[PDB]
Design a protein around this ligand. Structure first.
Ligand SMILES: CCCCCCCCCCCCCCCCCC(=O)OC[C@H](COP(=O)([O-])OCC(O)COP(=O)([O-])OC[C@@H](COC(=O)CCCCCCCCCCCCCCCCC)OC(=O)CCCCCCCCCCCCCCCCC)OC(=O)CCCCCCCCCCCCCCCCC
Ligand SMILES: CCCCCCCCCCCCCCCCC[C@@H](O)O[C@H](CO[C@H](O)CCCCCCCCCCCCCCC)COP(=O)(O)OCC[N+](C)(C)C
Ligand SMILES: CCCCCCCC/C=C\CCCCCCCC(=O)OC[C@H](COP(=O)(O)OCCN)OC(=O)CCCCCCC/C=C\CCCCCCCC
Ligand SMILES: CCCCCCCC/C=C\CCCCCCCC(=O)O[C@H](COC(=O)CCCCCCC/C=C/CCCCCCCC)COP(=O)(O)OCCN
Ligand code: SF4
Ligand code: SF4
Ligand code: SF4
Lengths: 303, 210, 56, 70, 144, 176, 156
């Protein structure tokens, strides 16, 4: 019954990313003294379905000269990576129990830039290529600090196994052990998914949108598991599932809140932000988190 | 609005910027020559269409100066009141669309509710939300309805909190400051020699207000 | 505006002000949509005498 | 009012309930009512292989107690 | 607190005639508020007010399901309001046409019509004047 | 009298420098802006439920045009052509002649509604209150041709809206 | 029979989906754009009908011409219109776009945007109220609801 498990992982995620559009519209509207969609469906609830059908029945505008191969490949890679990044996560029990699950998620996120590169290349435009290059540069820049912050945090866990993160946070959350790293991690996950204040950039358009929103939800779930450790009772995992889902929803709504609250950076300003504020602090706190367990004789078990 | 902008870039930096205008040239000045003064009044509503009443007042004052007459005191007080209301409308529009273009977008809705209230005032006085054509070169078209002043007072006693919320979203925000500070710096002498007026002068320290 | 006493406290704390004192939404405090007839006085030149146009 | 955002969120929450819960139940069903065995480091895998060989049914989760010691 | 607001929601469900009326109003108007009935319309529109709502929401109309010739269960529009209720509903006056009705005339339409654009009964412009120059008519008789 | 908007000098004592450093490193003003947006979410939206609710209007509002008539049912227009002379947009076209009873009436009265600027000069130029600009604004059309009104269409508009038009004129005529 | 019943229901579904999510791009040429932004302001909240604010041309369902179209601007508007994916609709807002308006007798103004692109709905006014533009958008929705593409294909 492994195929049923794969399907019960894939399908609910796609429904969640479909209704996240509704939630975002509703939340931004109410923060803007108005409503979101409240006409299509009893409480707007049929708006995502109408959006999907309309998008899937509209003419697709193939560039008529661009590389059709990469034009079709880019959304495939984007959505495949987005759906793959959900497999490693333990909610409480993971679909695939990987020893180096964190490294696997890092590698998937690193691949996620080929879709941007290929979509920019296959637009047959100089301006869109400029935009794609900017997006790729921002993404790689911030995944640097994601990797460094992540290993610094994992030094208190003892391994790359994501399940052990539940064991590490049995008594206290990781947010109390390292809140500065969590702050920079949150900003880096904003900048990684091209979300405001870092949003400088028919069918396949919807495919790309689905991939981006799935990446948003997965990144927030990863943040919740990494820094907000729920308590897991082996004889009733549904408590852990509900707690983890609530925390993930809170973080996604916080993304919407941030989008509704701020202006956006310039390109050079966010580049300077990273390279001159996050990287120095990230290196310093990596040094500190290497030294800390040895100084206090609190090194985690697994080797 | 509608704008074409041809520029030359060396990498990130802007080297040259040449704006192309005339995409909204309707030929208003030639059309005015075929109308009477009254018939030519409504063009000034359409000129700067965010501050409709102020445009009307300028034309009316010019025609009054040429006619050698003067509006009565009540008309003048009405004109100054609605000129200040129009200044509120225009500054809301300018600040919130600036912020929207930068990417803030929330104060736009917050303040466009107030803009809707001021269109209610414009509508009560003239029957039209924007192009009122209320200020005529002899005064104003019609008297204020009986309950208008009370509603204006009720509106204007809550607006300071709206400006405060705008400032809380914008003034001390570091992203906003980094987007605005030291951008487009213009000296007083250049502002004067280039024909600037209004805040473009006063932002450079020139003390001038008509 | 009608809101639960707890919602009012939450929104007041988050904003930093008293929201109930100055509300964005208009209520019965506005003027009536039916008003008494006006009278609208006449101007200075409505005299019956000493009002030749060449003097004004 | 704001609570009219709650329906969609609820729907979204229900969707995010489905994967994890499903996994748990499947791990109960294919593992004889117990959590799926974790096998890192290859000593754990050796334990599972020994269990599978001594079950008599080629299934590691069929546990043999003292009733099998004779 | 929470108990009070849930009781008010329950009263809203009760005051629309039960569950069927609740879903009817929710799916026809996307609103389930209850207000005092102000008037019935001869075409079937119903008019409600609630002076504790803020300005703009204190008056509303529930449209009839069948106006002159079309089913209007879903396809409603604002042009279906007759002029007297139009004047009241836009807050041009504080007085509904029930307490004081409009003046009666022999030329005023007894049946209001909605916007008939895109229907066979749409308006088609034409010149309402006669022919200016009329032509010469040759005789029917032979000339030779 | 003039004011200074940005002529403040930050204090350089250790406590003020530490406060600014705490603002930089802990994002205090960003959290303040988030707090205002959160507070602002927890209040009533300003949206009205159109078309079941309508925005406020006034007796003075200028909408679709209408030709009126006297209580006997006889039309007020006397073909004086002042509305046509005053129209800033040249949107009114008029032709007249003596009627069968010798009355001074129009045979043609067109208003091009795609030329009209809805200034209402025509109704304030009329000496008999014949042409008015009524309170209707929901008269959008699917073809250009149906926005070119002739005398029959405008007289129909008058007969259709006479109740509301007369009430509005009663409300507003003492200000004119 | 079932052959026409199935296409009738499927056409109804496609029409509902198309009209319940109308994504407009707006040509804010002149002061009718202020009234369309007032239609997106909190009081009317066009987004609550499924009509998003400021869609991109490559994913736009309807074009709203709001302002005067000058001769200098007409080719750009036609170029933008051609780019849009089909099915595409055009709403003409205000006197200037409907028929030239107050600049009809000008040397530099297009006497109606329907010389350049076909128009589905004409919203009159100078400017139309935001409520009048909302009435026009809902009229376009009803017009979309009336159309029936699958029946024509089945019966041809
Ligand atoms: C949260 C749990 C649900 C209850 C709830 O949200 O109540 C919010 C209710 C909202 O109060 P408010 O918006 O500040 O004041 C305006 C009146 O409540 C305005 O109240 P009203 O007269 O519009 O009440 C309408 C009534 C009926 O409303 C409905 O039936 C439609 C909405 C159903 C949503 C479900 O509301 C309900 O019964 C549904 C309440 C929420 C259900 C979820 O008060 C609270 O529960 C605050 C609790 C603390 C939350 C943090
Ligand atoms: C599992 C396999 C899925 C495959 C793909 C299928 C797509 C998903 C299926 C679900 C679609 C959801 C349909 C929702 C339609 C109901 C909307 C309803 O409320 O509309 C009303 C009903 O109108 C119409 O009668 C609805 C017709 C919709 C289609 C009817 C049956 C179609 C079923 C065919 C599905 C089979 C597909 C075959 C190939 C996949 C009219 O309201 P409207 O006018 O808007 O709004 C006016 C505004 N007011 C009311 C507030 C004043
Ligand atoms: C796409 C990524 C493919 C590989 C992802 C999985 C890697 C992984 O870490 O797990 C492999 C997993 C378990 O690893 P552990 O963590 O050590 O735990 C098990 C020991 N008890 O076991 C496997 O080896 C399964 C996969 C092995 C065979 C195939 C591997 C993947 C091959 C990918 C080919 C696709 C290449 C095409 C070009 C790619 C360009 C985008
Ligand atoms: C005794 C031994 C103790 C061990 C050492 C511990 C000491 C720690 C003290 C300092 C730690 C603070 C570091 C935390 C992060 C600091 C990074 C930073 O401050 O960068 C800012 C910039 O940071 C930002 O502004 C990014 C904001 C982007 C918008 C996003 C809004 C997010 C705010 C809402 C709350 C976010 C919640 C985050 C946590 C979530 C948890 C999952 C500086 O840039 P500028 O002000 O522009 O000037 C630099 C040039 N001089
Ligand atoms: S409202 Fe103005 S533009 Fe329109 S017909 Fe009357 S006078 Fe002419
Ligand atoms: S409508 Fe009035 S102003 Fe115009 S021609 Fe007739 S009587 Fe004269
Ligand atoms: S149509 Fe009227 S309101 Fe719109 S831009 Fe032209 S003159 Fe202004």
């Amino acid at each position: 019954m492994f195929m049923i498990n794969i399907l019960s992982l894939i399908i609910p995620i796609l429904l969640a990313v479909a209704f996240l559009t509704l939630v975002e519209r509703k939340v931004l509207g109410y923060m803007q003294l108005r409503k979101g969609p409240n006409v299509v469906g009893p409480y707007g609830l049929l708006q995502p379905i109408a959006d999907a059908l309309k998008l899937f029945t509209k003419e697709p505008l193939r560039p008529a000269t661009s590389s059709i191969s990469m034009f079709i490949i880019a959304p495939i890679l984007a959505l495949s990576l987005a759906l793959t990044m959900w497999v490693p996560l333990p909610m409480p029990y993971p679909l695939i129990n990987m020893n180096l699950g964190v490294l696997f998620m890092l590698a998937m996120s690193s691949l996620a830039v080929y879709s941007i590169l290929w979509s920019g290349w296959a637009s047959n435009s100089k301006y869109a290529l400029i935009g794609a290059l900017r997006a790729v540069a921002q993404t790689i820049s911030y995944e640097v600090t994601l990797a460094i912050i992540l290993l610094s945090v994992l030094l208190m866990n003892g391994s790359y196994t994501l399940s052990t993160l539940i064991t590490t946070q049995e008594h206290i959350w990781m947010i109390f052990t390292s809140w500065p790293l969590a702050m920079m991690w949150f900003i880096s996950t904003l900048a990684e998914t091209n979300r405001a204040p870092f949003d400088l950039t028919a069918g396949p358009f919807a495919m790309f949108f689905m991939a981006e929103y799935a990446n948003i939800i997965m990144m927030n779930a990863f943040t919740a598991i990494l820094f907000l450790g729920a308590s897991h009772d082996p004889h009733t995992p549904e408590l852990y599932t509900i707690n983890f889902v609530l925390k993930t929803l809170a973080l996604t709504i916080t993304f919407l809140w941030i989008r509704a609250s701020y202006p956006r950076f310039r390109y050079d300003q966010l580049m300077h932000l990273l390279w001159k504020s996050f990287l120095p602090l990230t290196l310093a706190l990596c040094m500190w988190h290497i030294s800390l367990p040895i100084m206090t004789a609190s090194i985690p078990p697994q080797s | 609005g509608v704008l074409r902008l041809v520029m030359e870039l060396s990498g990130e930096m802007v080297r040259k910027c040449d704006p192309h205008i005339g995409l909204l040239h309707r030929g208003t000045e030639k059309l005015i020559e075929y109308k009477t003064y009254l018939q030519a009044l409504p063009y000034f509503d359409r000129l700067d269409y965010v501050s409709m009443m102020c445009n009307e007042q300028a034309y009316s004052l010019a025609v009054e100066k040429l006619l050698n007459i003067q509006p009565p005191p009540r008309a003048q007080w009405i004109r100054v009141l609605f000129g200040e209301i129009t200044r509120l409308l225009n500054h809301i529009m300018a600040v919130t669309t600036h912020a929207l273009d930068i990417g803030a977008m929330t104060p736009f809705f917050w303040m466009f509710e107030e803009r809707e209230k001021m269109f209610e005032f414009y509508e009560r006085v003239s029957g039209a939300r924007m192009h009122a054509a209320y200020i005529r070169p002899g005064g104003v078209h019609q008297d204020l309805p009986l309950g208008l002043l009370d509603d204006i007072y009720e509106f204007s006693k809550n607006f300071s909190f709206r400006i405060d919320e705008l400032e809380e979203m914008l003034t001390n925000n570091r992203i906003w400051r980094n987007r605005t500070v030291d951008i487009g710096v213009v000296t007083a002498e250049d502002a004067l020699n280039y024909g600037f007026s209004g805040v473009m002068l006063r932002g450079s320290g020139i003390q001038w207000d008509l | 505006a009608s809101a639960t006493r707890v919602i009012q406290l939450l929104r007041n704390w988050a904003s930093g002000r008293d929201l109930q004192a100055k509300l964005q939404l208009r209520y019965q405090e506005i003027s009536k949509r039916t008003q008494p007839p006006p009278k609208l006085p006449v101007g200075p030149s409505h005299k019956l005498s000493n009002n030749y146009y060449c003097t004004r | 009012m704001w609570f009219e955002i709650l329906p969609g969120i609820a729907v979204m929450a229900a969707c995010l309930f489905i994967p994890g819960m499903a996994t748990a139940h499947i791990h109960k069903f294919t593992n004889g009512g117990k959590e799926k065995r974790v096998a890192h480091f290859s000593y754990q895998w050796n334990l599972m292989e020994r269990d599978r060989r001594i079950s008599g049914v080629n299934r590691y989760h069929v546990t043999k107690g003292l009733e099998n010691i004779d | 607190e929470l108990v009070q607001v849930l009781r008010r929601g329950l009263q809203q469900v009760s005051g629309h005639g039960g569950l069927r009326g609740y879903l009817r109003v929710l799916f026809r108007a996307n609103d389930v508020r209850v207000g005092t009935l102000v008037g019935e319309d001869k075409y079937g529109n119903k008019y409600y007010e609630d002076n504790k709502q803020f300005f703009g929401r204190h008056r509303w109309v529930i449209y009839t399901t069948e106006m002159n010739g079309r089913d209007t269960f879903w396809d409603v529009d604002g042009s279906m309001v007759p002029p007297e209720w139009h004047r009241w509903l836009h807050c041009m006056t504080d007085d509904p046409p029930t307490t004081k009705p409009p003046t009666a005339r022999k030329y005023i339409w007894t049946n209001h019509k909605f916007n008939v654009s895109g229907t066979p009964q749409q308006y088609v412009p034409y010149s309402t004047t006669r022919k200016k120059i009329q032509e010469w008519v040759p005789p029917s008789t032979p000339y030779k | 009298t003039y004011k200074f908007v940005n002529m403040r000098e930050p204090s350089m004592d250790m406590k003020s420098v530490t406060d600014r450093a705490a603002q930089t490193l802990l994002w205090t003003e960003l959290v303040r802006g988030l707090g205002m947006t959160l507070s602002y979410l927890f209040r009533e939206p300003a949206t009205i439920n159109y078309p079941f609710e309508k925005g406020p209007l006034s007796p003075r509002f200028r909408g679709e045009h209408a030709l009126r008539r006297y209580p006997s049912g006889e039309e007020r227009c006397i073909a004086c052509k002042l509305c046509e002379a005053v129209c800033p947009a040249q949107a009114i076209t008029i032709e007249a002649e003596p009627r069968a009873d010798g009355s001074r009436r129009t045979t043609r009265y067109d208003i091009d509604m795609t030329k009209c600027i809805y200034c209402g000069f025509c109704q304030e130029a009329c000496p008999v209150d014949a042409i008015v600009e009524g309170p209707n604004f929901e008269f959008s059309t699917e073809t250009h041709e149906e926005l070119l009104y002739n005398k029959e269409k405008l007289l129909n508009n008058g007969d259709k809206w006479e109740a509301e038009i007369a009430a509005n004129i009663q409300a507003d005529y003492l200000y004119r | 029979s079932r052959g026409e019943y199935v296409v009738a229901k499927l056409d109804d579904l496609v029409n509902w989906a198309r009209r319940s999510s109308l994504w407009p791009m707006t040509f804010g040429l002149a002061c009718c754009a202020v009234e369309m932004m007032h239609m997106a302001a909190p009081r009317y909240d066009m987004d609550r009908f499924g009509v998003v604010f400021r869609a991109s041309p490559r994913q736009s369902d309807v074009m709203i011409v709001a302002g005067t179209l000058t001769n200098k601007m007409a080719p750009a508007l036609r170029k933008v219109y051609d780019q849009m994916p089909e099915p595409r609709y055009v709403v003409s807002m205000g006197s200037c776009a409907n028929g030239g308006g107050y600049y009809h007798y000008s040397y530099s103004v297009v006497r109606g945007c329907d010389r350049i692109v076909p128009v589905d709905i004409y919203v009159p006014g100078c400017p139309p109220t935001a409520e009048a533009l909302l009435y026009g958008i809902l009229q376009l929705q009803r017009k979309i609801k009336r159309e029936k593409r699958l029946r024509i294909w089945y019966r041809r």
